[PDB]
Amino acid sequence: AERPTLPIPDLLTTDARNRIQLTIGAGQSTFGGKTATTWGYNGNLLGPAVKLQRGKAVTVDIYNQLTEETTLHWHGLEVPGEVDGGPQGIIPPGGKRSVTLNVDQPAATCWFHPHQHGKTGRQVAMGLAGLVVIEDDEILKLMLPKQWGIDDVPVIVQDKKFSADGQIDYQLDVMTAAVGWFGDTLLTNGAIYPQHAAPRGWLRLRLLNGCNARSLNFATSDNRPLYVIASDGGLLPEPVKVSELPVLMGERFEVLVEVNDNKPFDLVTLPVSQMEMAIAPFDKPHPVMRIQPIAISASGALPDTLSSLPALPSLEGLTVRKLQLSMDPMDFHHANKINGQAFDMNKPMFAAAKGQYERWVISGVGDMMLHPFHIHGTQFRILSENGKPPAAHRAGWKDTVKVEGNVSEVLVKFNHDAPKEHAYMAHCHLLEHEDTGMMLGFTV
């Protein structure tokens, strides 16, 4: 048995009447010979890549065929509260939901997943995640690698814990609420250590850390560089060459990597400093996927310049908001907090100004856990990350910011409304923390 081929999510576009159908359902997937019940969008596991065009409205019809309630959140999309599919956007079992997305942001890889209050971790663990590929008039002029599933590939990396029966083993209990749900089976687009057939020249990887709790650190088996071309919210001004790429839960980077000879190399994840994430088999470099070159040459290029990043404005005069994350020293369902309160679906913590720059200061000072802090409804600028100026590859458009025993500062603006009944969320994207209170709503 050769390694399995990397599964490629289907590139899903609008039909005749500008509609997209998404069915949330249960099926079966096989993992190392053993069948398991899994959940998928438009299939058994994970989901398709929804492809939107900047400025072209589309309607998404969502059918919930699960045995519990769900929501469908578009992680990274600047859309109104009413289509954002946070915990208020309940779709009951057997239920249907329609949403109009009017995409009004630069080209980027976003994603979608459940946001059910207290169940998100379980619902992502069982298999639900999809991709969103935004294109605009600018990115297509660049001549990047762009053959979907050939030289432009999504890489959804996820660990799972299985019971001896072969079934996914999720439980949100008093330890998971603290440290997060993780396992020793690493999945790459839902496959174990797949291989991807790549043409000579530039391979474009759209990396997503789709793990509940585990952070990742991408490198190559032979330490060839990754050229970072994009972050969560789209293109950097120019490529940032790195030898390793840390990626928090819920973050996307797009990287070019060279396929310059006929020899296979792996994309790996390196050991991380995170409570209990460096236990074997993550105590050494762990293979993510085998890149197998084909003698085909690909025309994609690494442009010396990608885009223009607008100047930071003056920070004098801007509203400051302080967000203190805290974990109850020892009811575990409400142990994690922001500003001393566990998520109340009913009571938004504050109202942001529409179209007005704000500085949000997020503080994990008082514990040493990793909190990838995610704000809905915006692509922001990181001003300070964990008490340093941001790394070059992290200094563009971001929807997540590291908070780990220190203080981060991001420049935020909300171009779209979110009323009380469909508030935006701001939360830790360690899903078990989210599910145990580490989240607020806010209005616009």
**Is residue 291 close enough to count as binding Cu ion by CB under 5 A?**
no
Pair 208, 154: CB distance under 8 Å: yes
Q: Tell the smallest beta-carbon distance from residue 180 to Cu ion (Å).
A: 8
Cα–Cα distance between 192 and 195 in angstroms, integer? 9
Beta bridge mates, 430 = none
Segment holding 178, helix H or strand E: helix 176-179
Sign of CA dihedral 298, 304, 309, 315: positive
Pair 429, 209: CB distance under 8 Å: no
**Is residue 427 close enough to count as binding Cu ion by CB under 5 A?**
no
Cα–Cα distance between 197 and 282 in angstroms, integer? 26
Cα–Cα distance between 264 and 262 in angstroms, integer? 7
For 402, phi and psi rounded to 5 degrees?
-70, 135
Residue with tokens 């474009």: 204
Q: Tell the smallest beta-carbon distance from residue 6 to Cu ion (Å).
A: 26
Segment holding 431, helix H or strand E: helix 431-434
Write the interaction track for Cu ion spanning residues 340-379; mark x where CB under 5 A is met and - where it is not.
-------------------------------x----x---
Q: Tell the smallest beta-carbon distance from residue 438 to Cu ion (Å).
A: 5
Beta bridge mates, 289 = 267
DSSP string spanning 62-100?
A: EEE-SSS-B--EEET----GGGS--TT--B-TT-EEEEE
The pair of structure tokens assigned to 62 is: 């969502």
The pair of structure tokens assigned to 88 is: 């208020």
Q: Tell the smallest beta-carbon distance from residue 189 to Cu ion (Å).
A: 21
Q: Which of 134, 235, 430, 431 binds Cu ion (CB under 5 A)?
A: 430
Cβ distance to Cu ion smaller for residue 240 or 431: 431
Q: Tell the smallest beta-carbon distance from residue 443 to Cu ion (Å).
A: 16
Cβ distance to Cu ion smaller for residue 114 or 199: 114
Count CB atoms within 10 A of the CB of residue 237.
13
Q: Which of 12, 29, 75, 101 binds Cu ion (CB under 5 A)?
A: 75
Q: Tell the smallest beta-carbon distance from residue 221 to Cu ion (Å).
A: 31
Q: Tell the smallest beta-carbon distance from residue 369 to Cu ion (Å).
A: 6
Quick check: helix, strand or coil at residue 335? coil
Cβ distance to Cu ion smaller for residue 31 or 41: 41
**Is residue 428 close enough to count as binding Cu ion by CB under 5 A?**
yes
Which residue has the closest beta carbon to Cu ion? 428
The pair of structure tokens assigned to 313 is: 């404005």
Cα–Cα distance between 197 and 214 in angstroms, integer? 27
DSSP string spanning 99-125?
A: EEE---S-SEEEEEE---TTTHHHHHH
Q: Tell the smallest beta-carbon distance from residue 204 to Cu ion (Å).
A: 24
Cβ distance to Cu ion smaller for residue 151 or 435: 435
Cβ distance to Cu ion smaller for residue 75 or 381: 75
Q: Which of 119, 196, 402, 433 binds Cu ion (CB under 5 A)?
A: 433
Q: Tell the smallest beta-carbon distance from residue 278 to Cu ion (Å).
A: 18
Footprint of Cu ion (CB under 5 A): 75, 371, 376, 428, 430, 433
